[PDB]
Amino acid sequence: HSHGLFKKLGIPGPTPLPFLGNILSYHKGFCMFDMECHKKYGKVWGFYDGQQPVLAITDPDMIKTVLVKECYSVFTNRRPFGPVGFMKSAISIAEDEEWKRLRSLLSPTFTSGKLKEMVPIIAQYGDVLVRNLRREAETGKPVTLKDVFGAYSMDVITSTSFGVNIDSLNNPQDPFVENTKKLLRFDFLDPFFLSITVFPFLIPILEVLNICVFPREVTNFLRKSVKRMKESRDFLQLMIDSQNSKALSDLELVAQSIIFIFAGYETTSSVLSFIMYELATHPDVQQKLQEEIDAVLPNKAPPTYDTVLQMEYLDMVVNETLRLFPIAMRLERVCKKDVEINGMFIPKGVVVMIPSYALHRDPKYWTEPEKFLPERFSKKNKDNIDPYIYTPFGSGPRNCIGMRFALMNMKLALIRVLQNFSFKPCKETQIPLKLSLGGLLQPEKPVVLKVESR
Ligand code: HEM
Ligand SMILES: Clc1ccccc1C(c1ccccc1)(c1ccccc1)n1ccnc1
């Protein structure tokens, strides 16, 4: 509404400009902005994404109330996105009862057991990753990990979310890979998304203008790939089985499968790149992990679902990387009605934000927060960690529904990569690594390392 909201409410924060709000402070990035507001304004602060008031919180008792306790009542949705079109039936886009329906219809799909049946599919794609990484190893040149890791995550998310085993997509150009690489190029963030927050009044203009985020041609191609696969009779196989049992629509099923591709693409690759950078800069950790990988899996044994859940240091290396690098950076909930959370009034429409990046590097909960130290997640130090400060996958009923799949997908990759390759930085390697100023938290310069046969 007005810019005097947090002023009248007595909530500290940066002074906004008349129409821009606090967007000019974003030239440093979402992460550096949140940490600056944390050190300056203390626990709770407020800013304006143009005209939208945003209230940031830090108290874990208050974060739990927003994410867990009062989720279904008030903080059920996130800030409405831009021109969604038919993707309104996406679980990340859906709101209120429509989302609660889609969340339940897809909840049995991401279960331990249903994920256990997908591991033989994901592991087979780790083999293609090992062969393609050894290819750039023979050239004796520093490997750009974004290519190999970006290919693996794309190959896994496509076969799991569409059944089609596209196998090597580093070079082959299946009509699926053609439309997939085209559709996965429709999310450059900066186009519209940033300016949408300044002018949310332009969102309804673009929706009626028939201009959508994903080109309908690729969408039409994705529909045939579902119908032709449906005409033949693993994410699509589990949602089709849900159809044969408020039911689940066929158009809705397409939108949900598209979300899984966007969700698990740059996220899985970035983390896999963030991890290998830390394994290279801290080779004492990489060696200790390879010893555990070879102990649980001798002679480059295949990674089993149960063995991955037994490798403990692998779990510690992934968790410590996700602390230093929360890909989402923030969690956001829209206040649906005037409420008082743990002794603070939040009016209707205000977006409540949790600076995950700032909390993951807050010196109160962490010691030497900037140094990569996997032992923070040891068995002796696993209990004193607040699950509402460390939220790389969010929390509450609206958390990352693809968390178990993502961690398994990435751990299966690291096994076959570490049990066959060693990683050391080159001259082009960025020390210290710089973070991207975009909206996904990526390595500023792509991770450039060297690989060995071992
Ligand atoms: C390791 C990589 C990943 C990270 C760090 C991650 C992190 C997150 C976070 C922080 C959220 C928001 C939680 C909240 O709002 O409280 C989220 C939401 C979501 N993630 Fe992920 N995610 C990852 C991979 C995936 C994958 C592979 C999938 C698909 C299987 C996926 C599907 C989703 C969906 C559908 C939502 C929205 C849930 C809803 O709106 O109800 N994510 N993710
Ligand atoms: Cl789930 C999703 C779908 C499409 C695009 C982005 C996301 C999302 C994300 C990830 C990193 C940076 C911004 C958004 C996302 C996060 C929070 C709320 C909505 C979407 N995501 C992908 C995997 N897990 C979460």
Ligand 2 pocket mutation pick from 185, 187, 267, 268 by most atoms within 8 angstroms of CB: 267
Domain span at 183? 1-454
Own/partner contacts of 345-351, CB < 8 Å, gap of 24 or more, are 345/9, 346/55, 347/5, 347/9, 349/1, 349/52, 349/53, 350/5, 350/53, 350/54, 350/55, 351/49, 351/52, 351/53, 351/54, 351/55, 351/78, 351/79
Distance, in Å, from the CA atom of 320 to the CA atom of 390, rounded to the nearest integer, reads 10
Ligand 1 pocket mutation pick from 399, 400, 412 by most atoms within 8 angstroms of CB: 400
Which CATH number belongs to the domain containing residue 395 in this structure? Answer: 1.10.630.10
- The total domain count for the chain is 1
Q: Please, which residues have CB within 8 angstroms of residue 304's CB and are 6 or more apart in sequence?
A: 119
- The CA-based angle 37-42-43, given to 5 degrees, is 105
**For residue 229, with 0-12 CB atoms within 10 Å meaning exposed, 13-18 middle and 19 or more buried, which class applies?**
middle
Cα(267) to centroid(ligand 1), Å: 9
* CB-defined site of ligand 1, < 6 Å: 91-92, 103, 259-260, 263-264, 267-268, 271, 327-328, 331, 392-395, 398-402, 405-406
Instruction: Say if CB 75 and CB 336 are below 8 A apart.
Output: yes
CA distances for 345 relative to 69, 269, 287, 333, 356, angstroms:
16, 40, 51, 15, 22
CA terminus-to-terminus distance, the chain: 61
Distance, in Å, from the CA atom of 165 to the CA atom of 204, rounded to the nearest integer, reads 39
Nearest to 313 by CA among 453, 415, 387: 415
Instruction: Say if CB 189 and CB 438 are below 8 A apart.
Output: yes
Nearest to 96 by CA among 353, 337, 338, 402: 337
Cα(251) to centroid(ligand 2), Å: 21
Judge whether 212 is annotated as a binding position.
no
**Resolution in angstroms, to 1 decimal, for this deposition?**
2.9
Distance, in Å, from the CA atom of 262 to the CA atom of 255, rounded to the nearest integer, reads 11
- What was the structure determination method? X-ray
Distance, in Å, from the CA atom of 309 to the CA atom of 290, rounded to the nearest integer, reads 16
Distance, in Å, from the CA atom of 422 to the CA atom of 286, rounded to the nearest integer, reads 8
Position in ligand 1 atom list of the atom nearest CA 99: 41
Nearest to 58 by CA among 365, 420, 278: 365
- The CA-based angle 302-405-326, given to 5 degrees, is 115
Nearest CA, atom 7, ligand 1: 393
Q: Are strands 52-56 and 351-355 parallel, antiparallel or unpaired?
A: parallel
